[PDB]
Design an enzyme around this catalytic site. Structure first.
Site, mmCIF file in Angstrom:
data_model
loop_
_atom_site.group_PDB
_atom_site.id
_atom_site.type_symbol
_atom_site.label_atom_id
_atom_site.label_comp_id
_atom_site.label_asym_id
_atom_site.label_seq_id
_atom_site.Cartn_x
_atom_site.Cartn_y
_atom_site.Cartn_z
ATOM 1 C CD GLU A 11 15.263 -5.390 -2.984
ATOM 2 O OE1 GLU A 11 15.542 -5.499 -4.264
ATOM 3 O OE2 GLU A 11 14.274 -4.800 -2.579
ATOM 4 C CG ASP A 20 13.420 -2.258 -10.633
ATOM 5 O OD1 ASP A 20 13.108 -2.068 -11.881
ATOM 6 O OD2 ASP A 20 13.161 -1.479 -9.736
ATOM 7 C CG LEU A 32 15.982 3.442 -8.508
ATOM 8 C CD1 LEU A 32 15.650 2.570 -9.697
ATOM 9 C CD2 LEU A 32 14.677 4.074 -8.038
ATOM 10 C CG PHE A 104 15.427 -1.156 1.129
ATOM 11 C CD1 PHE A 104 15.416 -1.946 -0.014
ATOM 12 C CD2 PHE A 104 16.653 -0.747 1.646
ATOM 13 C CE1 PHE A 104 16.607 -2.232 -0.685
ATOM 14 C CE2 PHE A 104 17.855 -1.086 1.026
ATOM 15 C CZ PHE A 104 17.828 -1.828 -0.154
ATOM 16 C CB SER A 117 -2.172 -0.720 6.086
ATOM 17 O OG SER A 117 -2.784 -0.769 4.822
ATOM 18 C CG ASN A 132 -6.107 -1.697 4.222
ATOM 19 O OD1 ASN A 132 -5.141 -0.941 4.161
ATOM 20 N ND2 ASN A 132 -7.289 -1.359 3.731
#
Ligand SMILES: [Cl-]
Ligand SMILES: [Cl-]
Length: 162
Positions: A11, A20, A32, A104, A117, A132
Protein backbone atom coordinates in the site's frame (compact mmCIF):
# COMPACT_ATOMS: atom_id res chain seq x y z
CA UNK A 1 7.18 -11.24 7.42
CA UNK A 2 3.64 -10.72 8.63
CA UNK A 3 0.34 -9.15 7.49
CA UNK A 4 1.22 -5.62 8.57
CA UNK A 5 4.53 -5.67 6.81
CA UNK A 6 3.01 -7.30 3.81
CA UNK A 7 0.36 -4.62 3.42
CA UNK A 8 2.75 -1.84 4.22
CA UNK A 9 4.63 -2.94 1.17
CA UNK A 10 1.69 -3.25 -1.11
CA UNK A 11 0.00 0.00 0.00
CA UNK A 12 2.75 2.37 0.76
CA UNK A 13 2.56 5.23 3.21
CA UNK A 14 1.28 8.64 2.41
CA UNK A 15 0.62 11.41 4.86
CA UNK A 16 -1.40 13.58 2.48
CA UNK A 17 -4.74 12.95 0.83
CA UNK A 18 -4.06 11.19 -2.46
CA UNK A 19 -5.87 9.35 -5.21
CA UNK A 20 -5.57 5.60 -5.42
CA UNK A 21 -5.18 3.44 -8.55
CA UNK A 22 -9.00 3.74 -9.20
CA UNK A 23 -9.14 7.54 -8.63
CA UNK A 24 -10.48 7.56 -5.09
CA UNK A 25 -9.54 9.70 -2.27
CA UNK A 26 -7.24 7.81 0.08
CA UNK A 27 -4.67 8.49 2.80
CA UNK A 28 -2.19 6.68 5.12
CA UNK A 29 -1.72 3.04 4.36
CA UNK A 30 -4.36 2.24 1.80
CA UNK A 31 -7.20 3.86 3.90
CA UNK A 32 -10.05 4.62 1.44
CA UNK A 33 -11.69 7.81 2.38
CA UNK A 34 -14.50 8.10 -0.17
CA UNK A 35 -15.55 7.23 -3.67
CA UNK A 36 -16.93 10.72 -4.21
CA UNK A 37 -15.15 12.98 -6.65
CA UNK A 38 -15.04 15.70 -4.03
CA UNK A 39 -11.89 16.70 -2.18
CA UNK A 40 -14.02 18.37 0.35
CA UNK A 41 -16.09 15.35 0.87
CA UNK A 42 -12.74 13.59 1.39
CA UNK A 43 -11.54 16.17 3.82
CA UNK A 44 -14.73 15.79 5.80
CA UNK A 45 -14.38 12.05 5.96
CA UNK A 46 -10.77 12.39 7.11
CA UNK A 47 -11.49 14.74 10.06
CA UNK A 48 -14.29 12.47 11.18
CA UNK A 49 -11.92 9.41 10.93
CA UNK A 50 -9.19 11.16 12.96
CA UNK A 51 -11.24 13.17 15.29
CA UNK A 52 -9.73 16.58 14.38
CA UNK A 53 -9.45 19.31 11.80
CA UNK A 54 -6.80 17.85 9.68
CA UNK A 55 -6.59 20.01 6.69
CA UNK A 56 -5.77 16.84 4.63
CA UNK A 57 -2.59 15.96 6.40
CA UNK A 58 -2.07 13.40 9.22
CA UNK A 59 0.92 12.19 11.21
CA UNK A 60 2.60 8.76 10.93
CA UNK A 61 1.05 7.65 14.21
CA UNK A 62 -2.37 8.62 12.89
CA UNK A 63 -1.79 6.63 9.68
CA UNK A 64 -0.70 3.70 11.64
CA UNK A 65 -3.80 3.98 13.77
CA UNK A 66 -6.15 3.81 10.79
CA UNK A 67 -4.02 0.86 9.62
CA UNK A 68 -4.52 -1.12 12.80
CA UNK A 69 -8.14 -0.47 12.69
CA UNK A 70 -8.33 -1.56 9.10
CA UNK A 71 -6.47 -4.85 9.47
CA UNK A 72 -8.59 -5.62 12.44
CA UNK A 73 -11.81 -4.99 10.48
CA UNK A 74 -10.59 -7.23 7.61
CA UNK A 75 -9.95 -10.16 9.88
CA UNK A 76 -13.22 -9.65 11.65
CA UNK A 77 -15.16 -9.33 8.43
CA UNK A 78 -13.66 -12.56 7.16
CA UNK A 79 -14.57 -14.35 10.33
CA UNK A 80 -18.15 -13.27 10.13
CA UNK A 81 -18.50 -13.95 6.39
CA UNK A 82 -20.26 -17.24 5.77
CA UNK A 83 -18.49 -17.72 2.49
CA UNK A 84 -15.11 -16.56 3.70
CA UNK A 85 -14.85 -18.05 7.11
CA UNK A 86 -14.64 -21.62 5.95
CA UNK A 87 -11.91 -20.85 3.52
CA UNK A 88 -9.91 -19.00 6.07
CA UNK A 89 -10.23 -21.76 8.60
CA UNK A 90 -8.94 -24.25 6.14
CA UNK A 91 -5.76 -22.31 5.31
CA UNK A 92 -2.27 -22.27 6.83
CA UNK A 93 -0.89 -19.06 8.40
CA UNK A 94 0.77 -17.59 5.34
CA UNK A 95 -2.09 -18.20 3.01
CA UNK A 96 -4.44 -16.57 5.54
CA UNK A 97 -2.37 -13.42 5.38
CA UNK A 98 -2.96 -13.45 1.62
CA UNK A 99 -6.73 -13.77 2.04
CA UNK A 100 -6.56 -10.76 4.42
CA UNK A 101 -4.69 -8.64 1.97
CA UNK A 102 -7.26 -9.30 -0.74
CA UNK A 103 -10.06 -8.40 1.65
CA UNK A 104 -8.29 -5.31 2.67
CA UNK A 105 -7.93 -4.13 -0.89
CA UNK A 106 -11.25 -5.21 -2.35
CA UNK A 107 -13.70 -5.60 0.56
CA UNK A 108 -15.50 -8.61 1.86
CA UNK A 109 -18.10 -8.62 -0.80
CA UNK A 110 -15.55 -8.41 -3.54
CA UNK A 111 -13.63 -11.42 -2.39
CA UNK A 112 -16.66 -13.40 -1.61
CA UNK A 113 -17.38 -13.22 -5.34
CA UNK A 114 -14.36 -15.19 -6.33
CA UNK A 115 -16.51 -18.19 -5.79
CA UNK A 116 -14.71 -20.50 -8.04
CA UNK A 117 -11.25 -19.71 -6.75
CA UNK A 118 -12.51 -20.02 -3.18
CA UNK A 119 -13.76 -23.56 -3.80
CA UNK A 120 -10.35 -24.41 -5.25
CA UNK A 121 -8.57 -22.78 -2.35
CA UNK A 122 -10.51 -24.84 0.00
CA UNK A 123 -9.71 -27.95 -2.02
CA UNK A 124 -5.99 -27.10 -1.88
CA UNK A 125 -5.81 -27.16 -5.65
CA UNK A 126 -3.10 -24.44 -5.62
CA UNK A 127 -2.08 -24.10 -9.31
CA UNK A 128 -5.64 -24.20 -10.57
CA UNK A 129 -6.77 -21.56 -8.10
CA UNK A 130 -3.94 -19.23 -9.10
CA UNK A 131 -4.77 -19.59 -12.78
CA UNK A 132 -8.38 -18.73 -12.00
CA UNK A 133 -7.52 -15.82 -9.82
CA UNK A 134 -5.65 -14.29 -12.67
CA UNK A 135 -8.64 -14.14 -14.86
CA UNK A 136 -10.01 -11.11 -13.19
CA UNK A 137 -10.24 -7.42 -13.40
CA UNK A 138 -8.24 -7.21 -10.13
CA UNK A 139 -5.33 -8.89 -11.88
CA UNK A 140 -5.59 -6.74 -15.06
CA UNK A 141 -5.75 -3.55 -13.06
CA UNK A 142 -3.05 -4.14 -10.46
CA UNK A 143 -1.00 -7.05 -11.89
CA UNK A 144 2.17 -6.62 -9.91
CA UNK A 145 0.33 -6.54 -6.66
CA UNK A 146 -2.07 -9.22 -7.70
CA UNK A 147 0.92 -11.33 -8.75
CA UNK A 148 2.49 -11.06 -5.32
CA UNK A 149 -0.71 -12.10 -3.53
CA UNK A 150 -1.50 -14.96 -5.88
CA UNK A 151 1.96 -16.41 -5.41
CA UNK A 152 1.54 -16.11 -1.69
CA UNK A 153 -1.76 -17.86 -1.85
CA UNK A 154 -0.46 -20.49 -4.19
CA UNK A 155 2.70 -21.35 -2.47
CA UNK A 156 2.16 -20.65 1.14
CA UNK A 157 5.51 -18.81 1.42
CA UNK A 158 6.66 -15.22 1.52
CA UNK A 159 8.92 -15.50 -1.47
CA UNK A 160 7.18 -12.85 -3.51
CA UNK A 161 7.82 -10.28 -0.86
CA UNK A 162 11.47 -10.97 -0.13
CL1 LIG B 1 -12.73 5.23 9.90
CL1 LIG C 1 0.34 -3.35 -9.44
Amino acid sequence: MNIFEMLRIDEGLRLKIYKDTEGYYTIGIGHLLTKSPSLNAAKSELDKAIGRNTNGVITKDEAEKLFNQDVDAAVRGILRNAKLKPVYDSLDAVRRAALINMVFQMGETGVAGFTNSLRMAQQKRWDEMAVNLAKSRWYNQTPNRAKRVITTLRTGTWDAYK
